[PDB]
From Swiss-Prot, chain A:
Lineage, top ranks: Eukaryota, Fungi, Dikarya, Ascomycota, Saccharomycotina
Protein's organism: Saccharomyces cerevisiae (strain ATCC 204508 / S288c) (Baker's yeast)
Protein name per Swiss-Prot or TrEMBL: Large ribosomal subunit protein eL15A
Region (Disordered): 137-152
Underlying gene: RPL15A
GO molecular-function terms, A-Z: RNA binding; structural constituent of ribosome
Entry keyword Lipid biosynthesis: no
From Swiss-Prot, chain B:
Additional observations: Present with 7720 molecules/cell in log phase SD medium.
Provenance organism: Saccharomyces cerevisiae (strain ATCC 204508 / S288c) (Baker's yeast)
Name of protein: Ribosome biogenesis protein RLP7
Major localization class: nucleus
Similarity comment: Belongs to the universal ribosomal protein uL30 family.
Record key words, sorted: Acetylation, Nucleus, Phosphoprotein, Ribosome biogenesis, RNA-binding
The keyword RNA-binding is assigned to this record: yes
Curated annotation (Swiss-Prot), chain C:
Keywords: Cytoplasm, Ribonucleoprotein, Ribosomal protein
Similarity comment: family membership: Belongs to the eukaryotic ribosomal protein eL8 family.
Name listed for the protein in its UniProt record: Large ribosomal subunit protein eL8A
Gene Ontology CC annotations of this record: cytosol; cytosolic large ribosomal subunit
Quaternary structure and interacting proteins, as annotated: Component of the large ribosomal subunit (LSU). Mature yeast ribosomes consist of a small (40S) and a large (60S) subunit. The 40S small subunit contains 1 molecule of ribosomal RNA (18S rRNA) and 33 different proteins (encoded by 57 genes). The large 60S subunit contains 3 rRNA molecules (25S, 5.8S and 5S rRNA) and 46 different proteins (encoded by 81 genes).
Note: Present with 238000 molecules/cell in log phase SD medium. There are 2 genes for eL8 in yeast.
Keyword Glycoprotein: no
GO BP: cytoplasmic translation; maturation of LSU-rRNA
Residues of the full protein shown: 70 to 233 of 256
Sample GO molecular function, one term: RNA binding
Subcellular location: Cytoplasm
From Swiss-Prot, chain D:
Residues of the full protein shown: 308 to 399 of 807
Protein name: Ribosome biogenesis protein ERB1
Subunit architecture: Component of the NOP7 complex, composed of ERB1, NOP7 and YTM1. The complex is held together by ERB1, which interacts with NOP7 via its N-terminal domain and with YTM1 via a high-affinity interaction between the seven-bladed beta-propeller domains of the 2 proteins. The NOP7 complex associates with the 66S pre-ribosome. Also interacts with NOG1.
Localization in the cell: Nucleus, Nucleolus; Nucleus, Nucleoplasm
Biological role stated in the UniProt entry: Component of the NOP7 complex, which is required for maturation of the 25S and 5.8S ribosomal RNAs and formation of the 60S ribosome.
Note: Present with 2680 molecules/cell in log phase SD medium.
Similarity comment text for this entry: Belongs to the WD repeat BOP1/ERB1 family.
Superkingdom of source: Eukaryota
Disulphide bridges, residue numbers: none
Length: 158, 226, 155, 81, 314
RNA sequence: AUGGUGAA
RNA sequence: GUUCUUUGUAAAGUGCCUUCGAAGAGUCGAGUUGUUUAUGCAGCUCUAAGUGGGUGGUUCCAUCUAAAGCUAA
RNA sequence: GUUUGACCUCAAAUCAGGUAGGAGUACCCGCUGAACUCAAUAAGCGGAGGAAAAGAAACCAACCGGGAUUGC
C-alpha cells in the first residue's frame, strides 16, 4: 500500500522534498486564520494509523499556537473550545515554524447518525467522553499526566 | 492550422468512396450492355425495379468530410441538392436508376404519400424570381395563374396533382418549386440539445447504412419519418 | 527553489498522446453503479425464472494500484499533477521506474477521474487490454521517459 | 382523466367587412389603404386592409395572422384589467 | 406594492421563468404585493427548480462524459392553474374564444429551430379532435369567409366561440417563447376540454381512428343551420380546399368526395374554373346557405356569374 | 495571602 | 414452552501437507533550562534502528514490543 | 471551440436535519497556586459522570516466575 511508502517518506523529514514542502505550506498556513477547517489531512498515513477514517462525520482541523503547558494539549483545548459539539479524539504534528507550531487535529461528530450507527466508534458518543481534551484524556494528555507503567489517615473498628 | 488526423481521415474516406463509385459504374456499364456473363448480378431488386415511380429524396449530411467527388457532386448538382436537408421529387426511370447507387451514400430515398406531398407543398415552397433574389413563398395563386397555367396548372392543387400523378407539367412545376429546405432534426445546441443530438445519432447508424456492395439492393425507407 | 525530485510533474504528456491515452482508457471504463445494479437485477431475474469471461476495467484506487505495482502487474500508470498531497505521488514515478513499468503524468486530477466515474482518481493504471497499448506505451516512452530522462537535474 | 383582479378580458370586436367577397362600396380607394398601411402602429385603428376577390382560388393567404396574434398575446396577460 | 424587479428578486427566479409563471397565473399592476405572495406559494416554482437542477446535472454529466448517466437521468401539467383561472367549465369555454386563436394559428405553422416538430404535431392533432367533435354535435352556425380566413363560429353551449381557421397556404414566419408558453397552456386546457366534450357526447374516449385515410387527406376525414344539406353529396373541384368544405357538409350531415382522392346522389359539384363539363355551383353558395340557412337554389350561384355582396354576418 | 467590594 | 421462517455452490472452527508472512517519527533517545515527590513532565537545537529497540544486574544475560484506542466488576 | 464544463478553494441563507454556553459541584479529572521545611494544602480557572479516573505490560521480576486496572 501507499501508506507503507508514505510512512518511510515522512520518516526522513530533513530530506529535501519534505523541507521544501514544509516551507511551501508554512506560508499558506499563516495566511489562513488561527483556526480553520481542513478538507483533507496533509498526512493521510498518520491520521489513518491514528484511527481516523474518511467516512462521513469525521472532520480535520488545523490550529496555530505560539512557541516558547504542552503545545499539543493547548492546541487540542483551543480547537475543542471553538468546536464545542465535536470531540478531539487525537492530534498530530504536521509543520513547525520558528515563531509558531502547527498541529493537525481530527474531530469526530457524535451527533451525526453515521458515527452513532457503527459499533467501532459509537463509544465516543457517550457523555463520559464529553470534552475529552479538557481533562487531558487524549494521547498527549495521558503522556503529560505521567501515566507510565512500572517505577516510572485510616482507622478500623478494631 | 489543421491537425494531421483530419487530412488522413479525409484521404482514406475519399479513396473508399472513389473505389466504390468506380466499381459501381464499371458494373453498371457491363449490365447495360446485357452481357451479364462474368459479373456479380444482372437483375435489380429492392428490399426493406426500374419501373416508373415518384419518390422523395432528402440530402443527408455525412459521411466524413470527403472532398467533393466529380461523379456524385455533378449528379447532386443536376438535382441541385448540394445543401443539406434539401429534398426534391424525381421521376424514377431505368436510366435514372443507377443514380441512386451513384449518390446513395449522401441521400435517402423512399416512397412518399399523397397527404405528405400535400402538406409539404402547402406548408413550404419557394419562387426565386422577380434584381431577383427574393425568396417569395407561394402566398397566392396569382403567380401560379400567370407564370404557370399554360398547361392547365393554375393553382397549388394542380401542382400537387401533377407531382402525385406525374403529369406533363411535372418538370416545369418541380423546377419552379425551388425545392424546399427542410428543417434539421435537432436544430439546436446547448445543455439539452447536445444530449438530444447524441440520442438521435444512434438511429442514424441503424437507418442510414451503406453496404458498399456493387449489387446492394436499393436502400429505401418510409417517408413518414418526416 | 523546487528540488530536483519535485517539478517532475507539470512537465507532462503532449496534447495528442494525452488525447490518445484518454481515448484508449475510455474503451475500458469500469461499469458504473447504475449499470452494475441493472445488470445484477437482470441476472437475478434470469436466474429466478430461467459463466462469463473475466471483465476488464481501469485501475484507479491508489492502494490497490500500488499493490499491482511492485508485482509488475501494472502495464501502464497515469498520474495526476494537481494532487494536493504531493508526497502521495512523489515516490510513484520512482517506484515505476525501479520496477520497469511505463508511467506518465497528466495535468488535472478531475480529468483523470472523469474516465473512471469517480470525481477524482489521483492516479490510474491498466492491467489488461487490444493492440494499440504497445504503440501508446512506446509513444509515451519516447516523448516523456526518454526525452525527459534528465528530470533528476535542474531545480 | 376528466377533472370535471379577475375582470373581463374584453375580447376584440368581430369581423368588419373583411370578407373575400365584400360589398363593392367597402373596397376603399388606394389612397386610404396607403394611409392605413403607413399609419403609426398601435395607434392604428383597423386591423386589416380592404380587399375583394371573386374567384375562391384567387384568395390570398394572410401574412399578418402571426403579428395580430402576437399583439393580442400582450393584452392576454399584460392587460391591467 | 413592489416593483417588478423587486418581485423577481423576492422570487429569485429569472425573468424567463417569471414570464411563464405570470402567463399561467396572471399578474399586472407597481404590482400588488398580494399577487406576488400568492404566486410564491405556487408549486410550479418547485417544478421549475427541479427542471433547472436536472439541466445542470445533465450538463455536468455531458461534460464529464459517460453518456449513459445522462440517458439514465431521464426518469407535468398545470391542472391546478386551470381551476384557478377557470372556476367552472363555462368559464373555460368563455375564455376559449380568445385563447384558442393562438393554438389554431400554431396548427399551421412550419417547423423551425424556434418550434419543435412535436409542438406542431400536437397542435395539428388537436384540430383533428376539435373538428371531429364539432362535426358530431353540429354546432356550426357561421362560416364567414374572411381574408384572414374562414371565421367559424361554433355554438359551444351558447358562447359562440369566434375561432378563426387560417388558410392552408404556407404561413411564412417576434418572440415565439411567449407564444410557446401560451400554446402549452392552451394545449393543457384543450386536453381536459376535449375530454369533457367527448364524455358529454356519449362517445367512448379515446375512440378509434383511421390512418390510411389520414395518409390520403390527413385531416377531419379520420378519428370517427344543422338541417341544411341533409343527405347532400357534393363533388369538390381542384380549386377549392376540401378541409373546409368537407367539414361543413359533414356537420350538416352530407358527404364529400375529393377529386384528388386518387392523386350516385351527386346533387351538386363545387367548381370555380371558367370552363366546366351534377349541379355546378360556386363555393359561395354553401357559405351563404350555412350563414343563414337559406337553402337557396343553385340558380343564384351558377359558375362564372357576378358574386353577390357578402356582408359580414355580425 | 486568596477572591470580591468603592471612592476625589 | 408456543410458534412463521429455516439456504445460499453462505459462514466458522479444529489436526495433517505445502507456500507466504507487517508492528503508532520531530517519536525513543540525547543536552539544557523551569516544575516535581533525585523518577516524571514541559520549552528548545539535534533527533535516529529494525536478526531493531525499552527496563534491569552481571564476563552480556532475563522479560516485553512503546510513540493509537474501547472496556461492567 | 475567445463559447463550456468539471475539479479545487472562498462566501450567503428568516433553507432542512443537528449541537455548546448556564446551574449544581460532596466525590472526580487537568492548569494555576499563596502563610502561620509549611504545601505538589487552601482559594481561582476549565470539564464531566453516578461514580470519575485507570485498565488489558517497551510491568514487576534475578524466582522451582508471575500475568488487566483500582481498594484493604
Amino acid at each position: 500500500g501507499a501508506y507503507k511508502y508514505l510512512e518511510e517518506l515522512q520518516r526522513k523529514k530533513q530530506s529535501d522534498v519534505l523541507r521544501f514542502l514544509q516551507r511551501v505550506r508554512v506560508w499558506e498556513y499563516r495566511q489562513k486564520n488561527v483556526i480553520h477547517r481542513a478538507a483533507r489531512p496533509t498526512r493521510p498515513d498518520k491520521a489513518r494509523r491514528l484511527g481516523y477514517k474518511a467516512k462521513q462525520g469525521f472532520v480535520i482541523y488545523r490550529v496555530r499556537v505560539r512557541r516558547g503547558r504542552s503545545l499539543r494539549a493547548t492546541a487540542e483545548e483551543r480547537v475543542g473550545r471553538r468546536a464545542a459539539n465535536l470531540r478531539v479524539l487525537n492530534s498530530y504534528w504536521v509543520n513547525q515554524d520558528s515563531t509558531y507550531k502547527y498541529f493537525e487535529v481530527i474531530l469526530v461528530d457524535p451527533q451525526h447518525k453515521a458515527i452513532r450507527r457503527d459499533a467501532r466508534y459509537n463509544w465516543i458518543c457517550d457523555p463520559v467522553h464529553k470534552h475529552r481534551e479538557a481533562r487531558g484524556l487524549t494521547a498527549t494528555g495521558k503522556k503529560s499526566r505521567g501515566i507510565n507503567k512500572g517505577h516510572k489517615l485510616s482507622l478500623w473498628r478494631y | 492550422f489543421v491537425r494531421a488526423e483530419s487530412i488522413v481521415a479525409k484521404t482514406l474516406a475519399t479513396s473508399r468512396e472513389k473505389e466504390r463509385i468506380k466499381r459501381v459504374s464499371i458494373l453498371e456499364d457491363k449490365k447495360a450492355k446485357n452481357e451479364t456473363q462474368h459479373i456479380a448480378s444482372g437483375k435489380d431488386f429492392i428490399l426493406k425495379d426500374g419501373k416508373p415511380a415518384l419518390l422523395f429524396i432528402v440530402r443527408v449530411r455525412g459521411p466524413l468530410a470527403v472532398n467533393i467527388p466529380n461523379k456524385a457532386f455533378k449528379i447532386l448538382s443536376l438535382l441541385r441538392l448540394v445543401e443539406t436537408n434539401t429534398g426534391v421529387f424525381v421521376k424514377l426511370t431505368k436510366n435514372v436508376y443507377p443514380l441512386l447507387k451513384v449518390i446513395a451514400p449522401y441521400v435517402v430515398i423512399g416512397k412518399p404519400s399523397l397527404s405528405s406531398i400535400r402538406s409539404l407543398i402547402q406548408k413550404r415552397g419557394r419562387i426565386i424570381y422577380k434584381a431577383e433574389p427574393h425568396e417569395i413563398v407561394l402566398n397566392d395563386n396569382n403567380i401560379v395563374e400567370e407564370q404557370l397555367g399554360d398547361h392547365g396548372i393554375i393553382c397549388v392543387e394542380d401542382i400537387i396533382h401533377e407531382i402525385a400523378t406525374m403529369g406533363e407539367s411535372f418538370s416545369v412545376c418541380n423546377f419552379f418549386l425551388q425545392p424546399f429546405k427542410l428543417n434539421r432534426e435537432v436544430s439546436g445546441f446547448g445543455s439539452l440539445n447536445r444530449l438530444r443530438k447524441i440520442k438521435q445519432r444512434e438511429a442514424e447508424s441503424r437507418t442510414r447504412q451503406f453496404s458498399n456492395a456493387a449489387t446492394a439492393p436499393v436502400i429505401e425507407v418510409d417517408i413518414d419519418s418526416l | 527553489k523546487v528540488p530536483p525530485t519535485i517539478a517532475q510533474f507539470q512537465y507532462t504528456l503532449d496534447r495528442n498522446t494525452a488525447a490518445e491515452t484518454f481515448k484508449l482508457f475510455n474503451k475500458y471504463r469500469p461499469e458504473t453503479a447504475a449499470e452494475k445494479k441493472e445488470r445484477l437485477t437482470k441476472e437475478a431475474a434470469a436466474v429466478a425464472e430461467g459463466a462469463s469471461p473475466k471483465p476488464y476495467a481501469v485501475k484507479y484506487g491508489l492502494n490497490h494500484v500500488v499493490a499491482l505495482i511492485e508485482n509488475k502487474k501494472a502495464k501502464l500508470v497515469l498520474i495526476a499533477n494537481d494532487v494536493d498531497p504531493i508526497e502521495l505521488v512523489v515516490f510513484l514515478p520512482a517506484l515505476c521506474k525501479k520496477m520497469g513499468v511505463p508511467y506518465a503524468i497528466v495535468k488535472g486530477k478531475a480529468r483523470l477521474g472523469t474516465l473512471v466515474n469517480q470525481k477524482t482518481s489521483a492516479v490510474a493504471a491498466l492491467t489488461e487490454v487490444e493492440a494499440a497499448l504497445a504503440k501508446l506505451v512506446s509513444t509515451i516512452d519516447a516523448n516523456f521517459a526518454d526525452k525527459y530522462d534528465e528530470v533528476k537535474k535542474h531545480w | 382523466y376528466d377533472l370535471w383582479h379577475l375582470r373581463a378580458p374584453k375580447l376584440p370586436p368581430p369581423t368588419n367587412e373583411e370578407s373575400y367577397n365584400p360589398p363593392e362600396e367597402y373596397l376603399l380607394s388606394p389612397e386610404e389603404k396607403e394611409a392605413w398601411e403607413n399609419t403609426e402602429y398601435s395607434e392604428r385603428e383597423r386591423n386589416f386592409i380592404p380587399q375583394k376577390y371573386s374567384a375562391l382560388r384567387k384568395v390570398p393567404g394572410y401574412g399578418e395572422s402571426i403579428r395580430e396574434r402576437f399583439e393580442r398575446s400582450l393584452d392576454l396577460y399584460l392587460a391591467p384589467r | 406594492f413592489i416593483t417588478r424587479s423587486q418581485a423577481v428578486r423576492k422570487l429569485q427566479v429569472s425573468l424567463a421563468d417569471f414570464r411563464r409563471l405570470c402567463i399561467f397565473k396572471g399578474i399586472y399592476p407597481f404590482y400588488y404585493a398580494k399577487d406576488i405572495q400568492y404566486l410564491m406559494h405556487e408549486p410550479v416554482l418547485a417544478k421549475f427548480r427541479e427542471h433547472k437542477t436536472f439541466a445542470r446535472k445533465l450538463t455536468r454529466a455531458l461534460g464529464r462524459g459517460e453518456v449513459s448517466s445522462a440517458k439514465r437521468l431521464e426518469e407535468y401539467t398545470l391542472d391546478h392553474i386551470i381551476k384557478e383561472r377557470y372556476p367552472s367549465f363555462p368559464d373555460a369555454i368563455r375564455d376559449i374564444d380568445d385563447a384558442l386563436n393562438m393554438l389554431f394559428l400554431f396548427s399551421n405553422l412550419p417547423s423551425t429551430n424556434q418550434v419543435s416538430s412535436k409542438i406542431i404535431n400536437d397542435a395539428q392533432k388537436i384540430c383533428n379532435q376539435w373538428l371531429a367533435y364539432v362535426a358530431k354535435e353540429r354546432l356550426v352556425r357561421k362560416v364567414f369567409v374572411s381574408i384572414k380566413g374562414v371565421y367559424y363560429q361554433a355554438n359551444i353551449k351558447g358562447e359562440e366561440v369566434r375561432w378563426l381557421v387560417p388558410f392552408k397556404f404556407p404561413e411564412n414566419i417576434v418572440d415565439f417563447r411567449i407564444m410557446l408558453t401560451f400554446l402549452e397552456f392552451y394545449s393543457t386546457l384543450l386536453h381536459f376540454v376535449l375530454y369533457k366534450l367527448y364524455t358529454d357526447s356519449g362517445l367512448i374516449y379515446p375512440p378509434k381512428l383511421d390512418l390510411k385515410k389520414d395518409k390520403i387527406i390527413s385531416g377531419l376525414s379520420s378519428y370517427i343551420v344543422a338541417s341544411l344539406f341533409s343527405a347532400f353529396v357534393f363533388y369538390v373541384s381542384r380549386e377549392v380546399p376540401i378541409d373546409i368544405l368537407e367539414f361543413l357538409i359533414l356537420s350538416c350531415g352530407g358527404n364529400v368526395i375529393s377529386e384528388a382522392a386518387m392523386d350516385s346522389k351527386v346533387t351538386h359539384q363545387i367548381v370555380d374554373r371558367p370552363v366546366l363539363k351534377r349541379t355546378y355551383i360556386q363555393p359561395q353558395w354553401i357559405f351563404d346557405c350555412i350563414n343563414k340557412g337559406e337553402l337557396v337554389p343553385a340558380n343564384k350561384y351558377l359558375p362564372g356569374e357576378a358574386l353577390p355582396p357578402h356582408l359580414s354576418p355580425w
